[PDB]
Design a protein around this nucleic acid. Structure first.
Ligand SMILES: [Mg+2]
Ligand SMILES: [Zn+2]
Ligand SMILES: [Zn+2]
Lengths: 94, 111, 99, 221, 170, 147, 1112, 14
DNA sequence: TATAATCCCAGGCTGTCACGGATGC
RNA sequence: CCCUCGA
DNA sequence: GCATCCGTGAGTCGAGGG
């Protein structure tokens, strides 16, 4: 079971809304090279390699964890799309 | 644009003809040696489209620099072969005939 | 011939995604190699192999396009081919595409 | 602590009938005509049967298998029909705003027609659990408000109150009365029974219903 | 008929947590193959994609580092398991895979009830969701551990049965 | 279902039966363009009726009509649904004749078209939701405030 | 080892030859061993007799025929993919009615496929079996009118084809109606056409009250037979001019013509017996001296009227009765197709007779054998009852040949077959096996023939019974039909007998299938044996009477699925048929006569007999069968051995010393183990892999062709463009893989090069070409490689070349090469195991020997079965097999326990006791007492009530052993299991279903032509189908993007999928999907129907999904 | 119904 | 391109049921 | 597509 | 208003074989 699923499901008015928020954030992180993360270095999910701990390649995990943090804001009609896109590309170039 | 709807209606002979890229005159498939589409046959490239990407039948225009250009000699447009899945043919009947769906589907609409 | 009724029959015309990706990566890598040259010699190679308008020009036409003699443009083609050979022997990137 | 008795009682495996076949008599059997033989098998698989008894049992077995197959086919069909008729039903909003509802009876007329008796627990649960009350209900000093999703406990409580003769029927929001277009609303539908909570908007309850009816269909004897 | 879908015989891993399934190495390799190629380029196991694909083309040309790379690939992601016939939505469930030697798919003991899967030689199909949307959909919604109750009855579908009940009773 | 020892929540059956009661038959046209004995959806006839009462016209007198799931599925407003179920010929002919438009309301339609279904993550309710971190949100808030 | 056999029942007669149904049928059909003038009127002889003479040369007549020698032997046929057949020569003579000229010549009619010694066929190199079909026996039947209670329907049924089904009914208005080809007309008319007058019909039918009044119509008797005939012709043939000779021709052809109308001989006899009349011919009437004469119809109507009125001695008929159903064997079916082909040839003959010179003609010029050849060829190739043989083990073949199908041509169509036809009828007793039948849709349609059962010449099935006179059971064996059986009272075979006399004053018997308690004096007959009531397979299940029918069925069906093992053993417990089955299946070699064995070799066995002659038997070795199982015969004898007649010379596949060996004999313990055996799964000891238990040889045939093209010929070569020596290493000079080489997926069996198609080099290709300064070669690599997940060692290569002796291939094809790749398959995870009792499952775990629960003396069990299987499955036989198997393990002996005459409990108890005395006492003599753990488990047993309190540890342990349970030590701990565990020897088989064959995965690959959706099937490297129901799943979950993904990027969306793979391999997220191509196919296929399909926006303005490509 | 027979009639008219 | 020919491709060959709709006393 | 065999 | 013939339905996935 994905950790804190009860909490995430408690956050929203529909489970599917959660799914969308998560997937969108995952694509955001994948697009900006994770640089936009609200996670502190100790809050970073880790993959255990042959060598040692590395970052977690799965953006969805990251997204759900970030969503757990309560540092993300979700909703409809918060910002025009293009403006958001270019603000993110300005803050975090790819 | 975004597709919000799908309509299905009856097709006029004028509509049908306006779809068609040519009328197939002959009941011929392919040449029994060269294995190529017969002229005014069911597979004819003059109508439906080129067999090879951006290449005519005779081979006069082989490149993308010619697009929309119809070869004069073999009468084949130079374009993507994929259109052979798309472009419609047609057959003009001497005497008109009845679409059987509007005949034998009870109760008969025509009837 | 016999009736299709056919589901055991593959489609041999259309490219598989593998082939598509292969051609894509080949074009990209070729642009990488041609970027390591000067724009004129790269353009000469492109016009000689037909990467620009789709067809291969003769020496007189490339020479008339850049404004030089056929011998000159042929020699430019040669030195470009040579530099590409050197960069190929060095990097060995394109080898895989020779099948 | 006998293994048969253990597995049977715990529910791990086996049932009273199969066990009885393993121990006591095999029992009566059917003729191919659906008629019953007058002479039962006195044997158990422990004892072993006569070729005759075994033969009768083969009648029965064959009939059974056939039934199972043909049934599977028809059930598949029904399921497909159902999916096709319900597929556009999806929860499209929170409230249709309907004042309409249905009243779920806790009592059914006796076969003796002597009086009304309490409906079986499971039935009541299936008609009640996870539903929204369309009206305020005051019973056993407990206040059940309009807009309350009945929990399992709420339902048990209502059964109790029924046994006390306080309430014979429970008003509830139902898709039968739901005025939502091209689907149902949140309230009228119910719990999302997988999550035991109010259903998320956008859940497709048509396919759910269809499948839910479908799967046991193959089991219906 | 879809790309990125294999099938094999299912066997019961008891050792699986509810959210997991045994996925054979070969199968997992072929299904994730593009991701495996990309990850192979990210590492030094191959200069480029094509060389890596040709590398995987023959079985004796396959080394161990590619398996580790594959392990790096599938991290956090889930696949989909399905048994035919599919009677209800639980006929398909999401499982975070775990690579196993051998050709058999290892399934969790509980979820069997929802699949109506014993092992007589039943076989199941696998599917790899591609996008991040597909993945989030699978993990938040279609995850096995996330549906413990029948959407029909509202009773737990995943519950102890057979051996488990037997032991606890004993 | 009970008799066989299968627990099944009534609300599903209620959904289906609701789809069975979906249609009505006209016992009188009133001031509308409808014909006596014409069969249509209860929703549509009630909408038309409220439109006539609001207009002051005579309402359409109608009767409840119960049909099985098969006929009802074939009777749906979407011809892509009906054609993809059974009686394909009949459906396609009658639909073409009427020049009927499929509004792509249901799932099956969009499945055929390969589109995104109107349920779950594809529901218009939740699919327009946006995700923004406080840093980006504040950057945008400054860009908004400065103009 | 010694084999102890149980049971008090003495079988009087042995089992008849099993394959004899096939063999006798086909031989009786061909009569090749019969001189042409001694042949009877049946078979292909019947075919010739029916077809010829051909009139209107004016006359072409049949003299006789013959069968020649096969152009090739069997093994050669299989090798070269030819058919095993004999040339058919027939003698015809041409006779002009006028000239008197007689021209006579022997004509070649083509070839007739020949049946091998075991009862199979070889068609185009593939062994095949012809399955006997069941149907309604021809005759006259009467069944109650379902609509009208008290009334009835007479039905006259001919052979399949051979005539119309005729129904007779009494209509509501009272008239007698006749239905033919779905046409209702008064029978009175036809009766008049037969020449009947009201007088004869009134005296005949008048007795039955006011029945005959419905037969009375004055208008009919007011006209002579001619007028009535023309009338009926007008009734049956609207639009057809009622010319007299035309009507006579049609009607005669429809009823009195033996050529186009034939009842079965069985149909004839049954009609006679039912109606109490005698049939001269096989038709319903005759044409004699210009007029039609009655045979059937009047007695039929008389019987019908008698049945209707309630006239005594008249009854309806069971159409599922085994007396009213008959079996059409291979000879009869072959006869029919042969007949049709011959008639086609006759049309050809007449059509040739109307043309050409009327003077010069020969039987050669007239006869074209082509349609006959095509007819036979179609019967042995594309027909229904001709099936790919099941060779997996000998038993599979035997049963296959013993099958009975109700489907096929002339048979029931599926989904039109309900319960009545699928049911086990009371007369199935000793005839059709009540057990063996497929699971699922086919249940009840495919059945098997009983062991002692026989099919007679009339197509009916007979079962043996013993004559009982005055309470004395003789050895006289009377084979009875179902009706004959229904005439008597028959006691059970287990009936107590002192000598030949009935010992019991109360005996169990059957009257018309109904079980009844009777006196010895009332017993007419007696069962031969229990074996007679079940099939071959079902007779291989020990303790059958302890097994529930279903799991028994699975027992049989899975027995036929068993893969032959290298180490295979006959079961520790046997039913006694494990020998005969090997014999009749011709799997094992036998000594022809008495004599001395001259030589013994792997490839050869030479025997000198009492005659002095030296006979060499070649040995079949490592031969691949239909299903991929290896067939090889191991010599069982030593040089100079003295053999008698019928002694075993060599063991074939899956046989141990003349006994049938399918699976293995292992040591099982039935306990749960750590949830690995949860739900039918099984746990096995790794030791089984060590000693090569459950290991089999599997061969896989591969084939590639080199053909002539228009771009130039393909050729087999060792020169393959762009391949390293590493790739070509195991290839020989010609390009063929060497014998004995190990091949892995990706390896090349046969190198091949094909000239490239027309290639317009893309600018990238030209640039790269110029860069590497290498010319693109003419050919390309088409070479046959190894399918992923397959491989092995190469046993053989077969090369066929055009222009070489004895070799001619299909047009356009140069050369054909076949590579035979075999393998040795160790038991592994996912492989399926099963027993004769129906317990089945996959191996989920293989434990190292130290983890296996073991005996106190340190003997680890082989296989761990979960007990939870047994109770609901209700098969207890496996248990008894396990106990007696344990006693056998210790006493070192096997057993023969007949079915329903068994080894009962007490005897197994005694045997078990002896087994204990071996198992324990040895230890006490070894200077060891009882272990502490054993004492604990004994305490637990006392608490379990499994032992008696107060007895010594030894006595209690023995008390546990007679219960077949023993102390078992967990290998991970050393601590005992808290209770005693059942442990013994069980017979467990490896089935054909193995994970090596079934594992498949796909990323991308081949797509279908039109739809551009991926292919399917493993061999084609196909993708899994995501069905409607799966879409229902994803929809119910409400996962939109996963579904959409499945609908586009995964399957038919080409832009989507190419861009997808490209996106992933670049480490980019996948792109938004576009319209699936199959939708475009839908649109265009609707347009071809003249339907306009328009994709519109919200403004109803058209949106082109074809992007302008389809628009001018 | 049947084209052949119908044509035979139509031809039989002359 | 020249006796005279003038209405058939035969295939016949059967054990389901339920619903809707047109058709016939 | 038919058969046969698996679930 | 009530019988009768015609048309259309009748589980999924997988395997092998022709
Ligand atoms: Mg199973
Ligand atoms: Zn051209
Ligand atoms: Zn509502």
């Amino acid at each position: 079971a994905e950790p804190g699923i009860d909490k995430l499901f408690g956050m929203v008015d529909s489970k599917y809304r959660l799914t969308v928020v998560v997937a969108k954030r995952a694509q955001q992180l994948l697009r900006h090279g994770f640089k936009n993360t609200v996670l502190e270095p100790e809050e970073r999910p880790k993959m255990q390699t042959l060598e040692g701990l590395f970052d977690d390649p799965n953006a969805v995990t990251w997204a759900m964890k970030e969503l757990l943090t309560g540092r993300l804001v979700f909703g409809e009609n918060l910002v025009p799309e293009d403006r958001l896109q270019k603000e993110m590309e300005r803050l975090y170039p790819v | 644009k975004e597709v919000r709807k799908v309509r299905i209606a009856l097709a006029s002979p004028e509509k049908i003809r306006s779809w068609s890229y040519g009328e197939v005159e002959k009941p011929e498939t392919i040449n029994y040696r060269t294995l190529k589409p017969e002229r005014d046959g069911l597979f004819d490239e003059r109508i439906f489209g080129p067999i090879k990407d951006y290449e005519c039948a005779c081979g006069k225009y082989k490149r993308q620099r010619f697009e929309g250009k119809v070869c004069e000699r073999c009468g084949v447009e130079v374009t993507k072969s994929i259109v052979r899945r798309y472009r419609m043919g047609h057959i003009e009947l001497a005497t008109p005939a009845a679409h059987i769906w509007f005949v034998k589907d009870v109760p008969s609409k025509i009837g | 011939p016999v009736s299709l009724e056919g589901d055991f029959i593959p489609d041999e015309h259309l490219p598989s995604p593998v082939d598509a990706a292969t051609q894509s990566l080949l074009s990209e890598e070729l642009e990488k190699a041609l970027s390591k040259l000067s724009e004129r010699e790269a353009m000469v190679l492109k016009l000689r192999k037909g990467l620009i308008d789709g067809r291969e020009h003769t020496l007189e036409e490339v020479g008339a396009f850049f404004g030089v003699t056929r011998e000159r443009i042929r020699q430019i083609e040669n030195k470009a081919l040579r530099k590409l050979k050197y960069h190929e022997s060095r990097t060995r990137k394109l080898r895989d595409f020779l099948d | 602590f006998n293994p048969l008795y253990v597995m049977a009682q715990s529910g791990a495996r086996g049932n009273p009938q199969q066990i009885r076949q393993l121990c006591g008599l095999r029992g009566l059997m059917q003729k191919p005509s659906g008629e019953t033989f007058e002479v039962p098998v006195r044997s158990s698989f422990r004892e072993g049967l006569t070729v005759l008894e075994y033969f009768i049992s083969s009648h029965g077995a064959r009939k059974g298998g056939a039934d199972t197959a043909l049934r599977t086919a028809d059930s598949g069909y029904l399921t497909r029909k159902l999916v096709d008729v319900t597929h556009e039903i999806v929860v499209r909003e929170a409230d249709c705003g309907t004042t309409n509802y249905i009243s779920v009876p806790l009592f059914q007329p006796d076969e003796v027609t002597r009086s009304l008796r309490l409906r079986k627990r499971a039935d009541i649960e299936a008609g009640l659990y996870g539903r929204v009350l369309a009206r305020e209900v005051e019973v056993l000093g407990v206040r059940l408000e309009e807009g309350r999703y009945l929990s399992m406990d709420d339902v048990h409580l209502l059964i109790k109150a029924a046994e006390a003769g306080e309430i014979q029927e429970v008003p509830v929001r139902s898709p039968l009365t739901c005025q939502t277009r091209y689907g149902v609303c949140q309230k009228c539908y119910g719990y999302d029974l997988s999550m035991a909570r109010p259903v998320s908007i956008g859940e497709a309850v048509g396919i759910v219903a269809a499948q839910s009816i479908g799967e046991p269909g193959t089991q219906l004897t | 008929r879809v790309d990125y879908s294999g099938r094999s015989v299912i066997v019961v891993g008891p050792q699986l947590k509810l959210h997991q399934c045994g996925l054979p190495k070969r199968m997992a390799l072929e299904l994730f193959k593009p991701f495996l190629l990309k990850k192979m380029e990210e590492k030094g196991i191959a200069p480029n994609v094509k060389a890596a694909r040709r590398m995987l083309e023959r079985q004796r040309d396959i080394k161990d580092e590619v398996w580790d790379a594959l392990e790096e690939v599938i991290h956090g992601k889930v696949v989909l398991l399905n048994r035919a016939p599919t009677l209800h939505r639980l006929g398909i469930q999401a499982f975070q895979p775990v690579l196993v030697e051998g050709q058999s798919i290892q399934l969790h003991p509980l979820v069997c009830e929802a699949f109506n899967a014993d092992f007589d030689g039943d076989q199941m199909a696998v599917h790899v969701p591609l996008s991040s949307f597909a993945q989030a959909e699978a993990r938040i919604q279609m995850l096995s551990a996330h549906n413990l109750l029948s959407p029909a009855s509202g009773e737990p579908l995943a519950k102890p049965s057979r051996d488990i009940i037997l032991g606890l009773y004993y | 279902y009970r008799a066989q020892g299968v627990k099944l929540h009534d609300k599903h059956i209620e959904i289906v039966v609701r789809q069975m009661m979906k249609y009505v038959e006209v016992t009188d046209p009133g001031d509308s363009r409808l014909l006596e004995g014409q069969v249509l959806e209860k929703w549509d006839v009630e909408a038309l009726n409220e439109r006539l009462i609001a207009e002051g016209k005579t309402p359409v007198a109608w009767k409840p009509l119960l049909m099985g799931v098969t006929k009802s599925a074939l009777s749906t407003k979407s011809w892509l649904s009906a054609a993809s179920f059974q009686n394909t010929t009949h459906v396609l002919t009658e639909a073409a004749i009427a020049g009927k438009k499929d509004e792509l309301i249901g799932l099956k339609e969009n499945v055929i078209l390969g589109r995104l279904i109107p349920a779950g993550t594809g529901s218009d309710f939740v699919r327009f939701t946006q995700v923004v971190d406080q840093k980006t949100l504040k950057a945008i808030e400054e860009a908004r405030k400065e103009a | 080892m010694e084999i102890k056999r149980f049971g008090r029942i003495r079988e009087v007669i042995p089992l008849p030859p099993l394959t004899e149904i096939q063999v006798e049928s086909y031989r009786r059909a061909l009569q090749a061993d019969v001189p042409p003038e001694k042949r009877e009127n049946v078979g292909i002889q019947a075919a010739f007799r029916e077809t010829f003479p051909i009139e209107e040369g004016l006359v072409l007549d049949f003299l006789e025929y013959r069968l020649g020698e096969p152009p090739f032997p069997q093994d050669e046929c299989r090798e070269k993919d030819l058919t095993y057949q004999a040339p058919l020569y027939a003698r015809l003579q041409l006779i002009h009615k006028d000239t008197g000229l007689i021209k006579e010549d022997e004509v070649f009619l083509g070839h007739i496929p020949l049946m091998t010694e075991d009862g199979s066929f070889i068609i185009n190199g593939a062994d095949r079996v012809i399955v006997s079909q069941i149907h309604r026996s021809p005759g006259v039947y009467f069944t109650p009118d379902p609509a009208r209670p008290g009334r009835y329907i007479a039905s006259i049924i001919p052979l399949p084809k051979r005539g119309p089904w005729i129904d007779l009914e009494v209509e509501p208005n009272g008239v007698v109606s006749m239905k033919v080809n779905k046409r209702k007309f008064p029978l009175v008319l036809l009766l008049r056409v037969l020449g009947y007058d009201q007088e004869t019909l009134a005296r005949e039918l008048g007795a039955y009250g006011e029945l005959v009044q419905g037969l009375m119509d004055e208008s009919v008797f007011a006209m002579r037979p001619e007028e009535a005939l023309i009338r009926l012709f007008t009734l049956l043939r609207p639009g057809d001019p009622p010319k007299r000779d035309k009507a006579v021709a049609y009607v005669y052809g429809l009823i009195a013509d033996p050529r186009r109308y034939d009842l079965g001989e069985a149909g004839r006899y049954k009609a006679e017996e039912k109606l109490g009349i005698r049939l001269s011919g096989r038709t319903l009437a005759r044409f004699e001296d210009g007029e039609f004469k009655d045979e059937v119809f009047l007695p039929t109507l008389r019987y019908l009227f008698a049945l209707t009125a309630g006239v005594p001695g008249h009854e309806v008929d069971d159409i599922d009765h085994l007396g009213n159903r008959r079996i059409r064997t291979v000879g009869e079916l072959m006869t029919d197709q042969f007949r049709v082909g011959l008639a086609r040839l006759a049309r050809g003959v007449r059509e040739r007779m109307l043309m050409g010179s009327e003077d010069s003609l020969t039987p050669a010029k007239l006869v074209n054998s082509r349609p006959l050849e095509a007819a036979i060829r179609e019967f042995f190739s594309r027909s229904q009852l001709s099936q790919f043989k099941d060779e997996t083990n000998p038993l599979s073949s035997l049963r296959h040949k013993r099958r009975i199908s109700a489907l096929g041509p002339g048979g029931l169509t599926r989904e039109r077959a309900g319960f009545d036809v699928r049911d086990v009828h009371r007369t199935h007793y000793g005839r059709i096996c009540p057990v063996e039948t497929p699971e699922g849709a086919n249940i009840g349609l495919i059945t098997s023939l009983a062991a002692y059962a026989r099919v007679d010449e009339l197509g009916f099935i007979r079962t043996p019974y013993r004559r009982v006179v005055g309470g004395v059971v003789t050895d006289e064996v009377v084979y009875m039909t179902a009706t004959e059986e229904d005439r008597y009272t028959i006691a059970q075979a287990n009936t107590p007998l002192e000598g030949n006399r009935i010992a019991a004053e109360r005996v169990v018997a059957r009257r018309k299938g109904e079980p009844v308690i009777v006196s010895p004096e009332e017993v007419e007959f007696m069962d031969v044996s229990p074996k007679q009531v079940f099939s071959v397979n079902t007779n291989l299940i020990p303790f059958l009477e302890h097994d529930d029918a279903n799991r028994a069925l699975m027992g049989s069906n899975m027995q036929t699925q068993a893969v032959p093992l290298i180490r295979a053993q006959a079961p520790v417990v046997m039913t006694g048929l494990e020998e005969r089955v090997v014999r009749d299946s011709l799997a094992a070699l036998y000594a022809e006569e008495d004599g001395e064995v001259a030589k013994v070799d792997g490839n050869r066995i030479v025997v000198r007999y009492e005659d002095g002659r030296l006979v060499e038997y070649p040995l079949r070795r490592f031969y691949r069968s239909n299903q991929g199982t290896a067939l090889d015969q191991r010599p069982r004898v030593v040089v100079g051995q003295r053999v008698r007649k019928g002694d075993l010379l060599a063991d074939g596949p899956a046989s141990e010393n003349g006994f049938l060996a399918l699976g293995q004999n292992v040591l099982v313990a039935i306990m749960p183990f750590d949830g690995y055996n949860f739900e039918d799964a099984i746990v096995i000891s790794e030791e089984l892999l060590k000693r090569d238990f459950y290991t089999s040889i599997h061969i896989e045939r591969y084939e590639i062709e080199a053909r002539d093209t228009k771009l130039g010929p393909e050729r087999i070569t060792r020169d393959i463009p762009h391949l390293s020596e590493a790739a070509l290493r195991d290839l020989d000079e010609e390009g063929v893989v060497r014998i004995g080489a190990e091949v892995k997926p990706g390896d090349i069996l046969v190198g091949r090069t094909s000239f490239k198609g027309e290639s317009e080099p893309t600018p990238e290709e030209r640039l790269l070409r110029s860069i590497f300064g290498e010319k693109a070669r003419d050919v390309k690599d088409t070479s046959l490689r190894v399918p992923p997940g397959e491989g092995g060692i190469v046993v053989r290569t077969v090369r066929l070349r055009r222009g070489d002796p004895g070799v001619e291939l299909k047009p356009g094809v140069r050369e054909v090469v076949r590579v035979y790749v075999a393998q040795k398959r160790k038991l592994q995870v996912g492989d399926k195991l099963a027993n004769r009792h129906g317990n089945k499952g996959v191996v989920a775990k293989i434990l190292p020997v130290e983890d296996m629960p073991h005996l106190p003396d340190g003997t680890p069990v082989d296989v761990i079965l979960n007990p939870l299987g047994v109770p609901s499955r209700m098969n207890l036989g496996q248990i008894l097999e396990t106990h007696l198997g344990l006693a056998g393990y210790f006493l070192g002996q096997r057993y023969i326990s007949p079915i329903f005459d068994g080894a009962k409990e007490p005897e197994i108890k005694e045997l078990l006791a002896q087994a204990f005395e071996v198992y324990f006492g040895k230890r006490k003599g070894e200077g060891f007492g009882v272990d502490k753990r054993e004492v604990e488990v004994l305490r637990r047993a006392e608490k379990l009530g499994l032992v008696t309190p107060g007895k010594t540890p030894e006595e209690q342990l023995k008390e546990l052993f007679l219960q077949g349970k023993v102390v078992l030590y967990d290998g991970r701990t050393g601590e005992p299991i808290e209770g005693p565990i059942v442990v013994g020897q069980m017979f467990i088989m490896k089935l054909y279903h193995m994970v090596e064959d079934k594992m498949h995965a796909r990323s991308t690959g081949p797509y279908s032509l039109i739809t551009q959706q991926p292919l399917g099937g493993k061999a084609q490297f196909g993708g899994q189908r995501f069905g409607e129901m799966e879409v229902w799943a994803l929809e119910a979950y409400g996962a939109a993007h996963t579904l959409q993904e499945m609908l586009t990027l995964k399957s038919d969306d080409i832009e989507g999928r190419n861009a997808a793979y490209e996106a992933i391999i670049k480490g980019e997220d996948v792109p938004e999907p576009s319209v699936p191509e199959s939708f475009r196919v839908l649109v265009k296929e609707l347009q071809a129907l003249a339907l306009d399909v328009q994709t519109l926006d919200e403004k109803d303005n058209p949106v082109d999904i074809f992007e302008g490509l389809a628009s001018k | 119904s049947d084209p052949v027979r119908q044509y035979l009639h139509e031809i039989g008219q002359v």
